[PDB]
Design a protein around this ligand. Structure first.
Ligand SMILES: Cc1nc2ccccc2c(-c2ccc3c(c2)CCCO3)c1[C@H](OC(C)(C)C)C(=O)O
Ligand SMILES: Cc1nc2ccccc2c(-c2ccc3c(c2)CCCO3)c1[C@H](OC(C)(C)C)C(=O)O
Ligand SMILES: [Mg+2]
Ligand SMILES: [Mg+2]
Lengths: 50, 141, 143, 52
């Protein structure tokens, strides 16, 4: 349902899988790497068109 | 082929970037002159296209704008599958041919581009491409 | 009538949004244009006329819609112009949807196109995007 | 079949539509409300009713 695009390198990475969401950060998994990303550095996007 | 398959590619004239989409089953096209051949401009073009038609799959070459993160985001949101790797290339040539035929009727290249899109989509074979896409999609409803 | 469109501009964030509505269906297209001029309106019209069978465009008397360049585009494309609340209602609907999704996008124009998508795809029992294709196809398939 | 929009009288506002009488190399001959005018090509925009 959700994919996350994010920054570390000024190019946006993704789609990363969304594991958990907090008010300040999101926990995501790209390939075999779990990252804690600030909310300002993350774009959570729904597959609205499905 | 499926009523939901589109091919996209860029061509170039007068130093400007022309982004072209073709509905494979009908030959219907849409095009825009974009200020730079970037993922951002391509993603914006796709969001507009997906709002008009039932865009299920887009096939492109591996141009960096087509493999970009922003295009991935747009296709995810709109529900578009991307496939990578000659209909649009043949269509690019035809579009440039029509543009050259009408170029001196317009000041700006983008004006001649949209005239050529109109001419291509309205020309009846018989149905025109513009009639074919609507007929194909309505039958798929 | 299958060929009647209404066009109008509305404004958000200091930017100009040019909106076209296919009256019979409720289908819309929109662009954020850099200025509310006849030049930009004529270019938008040439694009619209290439996609759909645009026979008549109804607008208010905004100077961009009465402009010489728009009259030139309508002459080339074969469009009849009529001057003087479907589009007004649609401006308010589009702005409502934009407001609902605005924080999901950096650029206003991205939110605009998300809002056009949302409006055109939402089913009532067809969507507006289904209605325009059905209406135009029926005209073609029965001639 | 053709309409001409043009600028004259040192006015940036586009006038017309006028009737096209001749498209020359450097000037166009037009008729606007029975007035015959000769305008430089660069001050004339000649547009065909392609959409019919
Ligand atoms: C700059 C410009 N100035 C004009 C001044 C007076 C009258 C018409 C124009 C046109 C024009 C408009 C519609 C049109 C065509 C040309 C040519 C045939 C199709 O319809 C343009 C065109 O530019 C815009 C379309 C962006 C306004 C152009 O590039 O030539
Ligand atoms: C600037 C920008 N940067 C990004 C960086 C990484 C990932 C995505 C984006 C998106 C984006 C793309 C498609 C999309 C949505 C947002 C939101 C949902 C619909 O699909 C944008 C958008 O801008 C462009 C569309 C011009 C690229 C935006 O305005 O936010
Ligand atoms: Mg290419
Ligand atoms: Mg208005």
């Amino acid at each position: 349902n959700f994919r996350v695009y994010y920054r570390d390198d000024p190019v946006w990475k993704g789609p990363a899988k969304l594991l958990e969401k907090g008010e300040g950060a999101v926990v995501i998994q790209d390939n075999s790497d779990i990252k804690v990303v600030p909310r300002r550095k993350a774009k959570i996007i729904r597959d609205y068109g499905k």
